[PDB]
């Protein structure tokens, strides 16, 4: 809890480098990285999306070299989306934009999000429609009230499980996450063009106003991510969310702690 | 292990070349285009012809002989022939009655790398059941995991007219010795926006002030500049590419090997 000085020396720095895959709903054995073709409730009251139509937050707990009082301090992050060029595949049974047109490319509503934490990302539930019945097998806001639609402090949770927390009913809880650095962007709209930059030259610093990064409780580093890139439009017009993996490389150092 | 920068009368040198775009090159007359794009009968049977597939362009530049290695320090690059995209009269698709032709626009990948060795590629597939055509180097032993991430699919950008753009990306887990930059903008109506200037330098040094080091006295320029699609009168669409200029400042760095 009390943060003392940075230990330097021969064995004071270490590196995690992994990729997180996208859980987009994964209908069947052949469609990993897609959702199931989206359907719309008969009525506003009866909204109940199937689990394979709901993208979810991805999380990874990484065990770090054992210590001890010393804790691992996450100092810098590099991340990029892996496989951006795959979105140029405009020939795989898509929807011809017009007579003899190529297929309409992946585009539309996008959530690109990633966090680096010394513990689980902390989530606040917010519901578009509080009567939405989230499907068996997902962890969702419990005891939904109309207030759930704007804000309801009952809906707290930890991003502690994969294929679990739907994207559309959880956000980073801004009242918590002292020990995490989170960044995300929603671009909404059916025609929003994907814009994905890649570079191995961009480092992001994880230190706060006091020069302290996230501190890895239990010698664990917590990478969370979502990269819903848009929707794939099938020949029929039917639409599937399409996701992509995110690379992380985190510099860590040792910090003395009481 | 990287020692100090050698300075003096002949410590600096410059490479300056252009890379051409390989976009499919359908026939003798359509260099810089792809073949008019077709769409598979089914999701399962996706199998694009080789002349419908833009590919990464690469160029190995031999440097002066010199333990000393050449350090790539700065890059200037721009797309050559941006104005050519104003050609709205060459059997295009009238946007409307008495309209000019629809200009080149839509899905674009602008990418360029400067490396002391080949760009290192990771395979990622839109559809793992896509059959990449005979004559291209593609991800082998595709599994459904190939669609999101599959570490089997490693490769070197070591050959032209070879590596399709749509199934290879810079491998972010490698490329210590390369500086790569690219942007995908997707969408049928995405407007091209291409800036040109001889006044904009990009620095290639890392967090430790070391640029790429040219193994074997070789500098590796890679690039892709799929600008959009040309829409023919029929509505049929061909990718259109443009050449990329590079000018790389290099200096000599002492190294223990």
């Amino acid at each position, epitope marked *: 809890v009390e943060v003392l000085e940075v230990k330097t020396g021969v064995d004071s720095i270490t590196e995690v480098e992994c990729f997180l895959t996208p859980e987009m709903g994964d209908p069947d054995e052949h469609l990993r990285g897609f959702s199931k073709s989206i359907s719309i409730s008969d009525t506003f009251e009866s909204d109940s999306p199937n689990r394979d139509m709901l993208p979810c937050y991805s999380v990874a707990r990484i065990p770090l070299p054992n210590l001890n009082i010393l804790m691992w301090e996450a100092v810098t992050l590099k991340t990029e989306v892996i496989g951006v060029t795959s979105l140029m595949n405009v020939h795989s049974n898509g929807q011809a934009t017009h007579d003899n047109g190529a297929g309409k490319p992946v585009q539309g509503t996008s959530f690109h999000f990633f966090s680096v934490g010394g513990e689980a990302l902390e989530l606040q539930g917010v519901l578009f429609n509080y009567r939405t019945k989230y499907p068996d097998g997902t962890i969702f806001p419990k005891n939904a009230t109309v207030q759930s639609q704007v804000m309801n402090t009952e809906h707290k949770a930890y991003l502690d499980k994969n294929k679990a927390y739907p994207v559309e009913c959880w956000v980073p809880d801004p009242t918590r996450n002292e020990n995490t650095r989170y960044f995300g962007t929603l671009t909404g709209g059916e025609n929003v063009p994907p814009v994905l930059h890649i570079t191995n030259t961009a480092t992001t610093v994880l230190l706060d106003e006091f020069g302290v990064g996230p501190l890895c409780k239990g010698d664990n580093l917590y990478l969370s991510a979502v990269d819903v890139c848009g929707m794939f439009t099938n020949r029929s017009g039917s639409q599937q969310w399409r996701g992509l993996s995110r690379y992380f490389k985190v510099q860590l150092r040792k910090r003395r702690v009481k | 292990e990287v020692l100090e920068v050698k300075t003096g009368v002949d410590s600096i040198t410059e490479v300056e070349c252009f890379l051409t775009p390989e976009m499919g090159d359908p026939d003798e007359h359509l260099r810089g285009f792809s073949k008019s794009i077709s769409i598979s009968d*089914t999701f399962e049977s996706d199998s694009p012809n080789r002349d419908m597939l833009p590919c990464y362009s690469v160029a190995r530049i031999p440097l002066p002989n010199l333990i000393l290695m050449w350090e790539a320090v700065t890059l200037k690059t721009e797309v050559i022939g941006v104005t050519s995209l104003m050609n709205v009269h060459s059997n295009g698709q009238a946007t409307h009655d008495n309209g000019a032709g629809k200009p080149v626009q839509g899905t674009s990948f602008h990418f360029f790398s400067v490396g002391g060795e080949a760009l290192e590629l990771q395979g990622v597939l839109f559809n793992y059941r896509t059959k990449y055509p005979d004559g291209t180097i593609f991800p082998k032993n595709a599994t459904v995991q190939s669609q999101v991430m599959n570490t089997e699919h490693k490769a070197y950008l070591d050959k032209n007219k070879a590596y399709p753009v749509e199934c290879w990306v810079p491998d972010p887990t490698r490329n210590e010795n390369t500086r790569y930059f690219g942007t995908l903008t997707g969408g049928e109506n995405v407007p091209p926006v291409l800036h040109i200037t001889n006044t904009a330098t990009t620095v290639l040094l890392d967090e430790f002030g070391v640029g790429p080091l040219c193994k074997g006295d070789n500098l590796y320029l890679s690039a892709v500049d799929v600008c959009g699609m040309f829409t023919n009168r029929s509505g049929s669409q061909q990718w259109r590419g443009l050449s990329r200029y590079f000018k790389v400042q290099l200096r000599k760095r002492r190294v223990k090997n």
Partner: nanobody, 118 residues
Framework: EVQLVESGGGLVKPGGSLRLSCAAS????????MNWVRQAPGKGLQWVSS????????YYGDSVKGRFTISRDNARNSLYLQMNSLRVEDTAVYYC???????????WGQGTLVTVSS
């Protein structure tokens, strides 16, 4: 373009057995989930069984659970249905059909008649 051809259908006595064959030409058979659907004389259609491209996922209608077995040989471009413990109700023309993504069930064969009578 795409043709499916069924065979093996005929007369067998209740409690009997029978193996049906679908011969696929015109497409990479080995790439598609394949289905058996049957049609009892004068009644509508009724799905029997499905099998994935790699035979990882077989599904059966309730009416034949435990009696019928679907199988494929991707090297021989052929889908099979093993029909054991046949009943009078199992009398129908048995059709072989392809499922493609987004298309759903698209191409059918000519069907082969299975008559179960003493």
């Amino acid at each position: 373009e795409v043709q499916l051809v069924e065979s093996g259908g005929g007369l067998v006595k209740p409690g009997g057995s029978l193996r049906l064959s679908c011969a696929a030409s015109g497409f990479t058979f080995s790439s598609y989930t394949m289905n058996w659907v049957r049609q009892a004389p004068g009644k509508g259609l009724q799905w029997v069984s499905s099998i994935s491209s790699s035979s990882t996922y077989m599904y059966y209608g309730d009416s034949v659970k435990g009696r019928f077995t679907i199988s494929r040989d991707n090297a021989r471009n052929s889908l099979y249905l093993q029909m054991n413990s046949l009943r009078v109700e199992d009398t129908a023309v048995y059709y072989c059909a392809r499922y493609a993504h987004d298309w759903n069930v698209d191409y059918w064969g000519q069907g082969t008649l299975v008559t179960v009578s003493s």
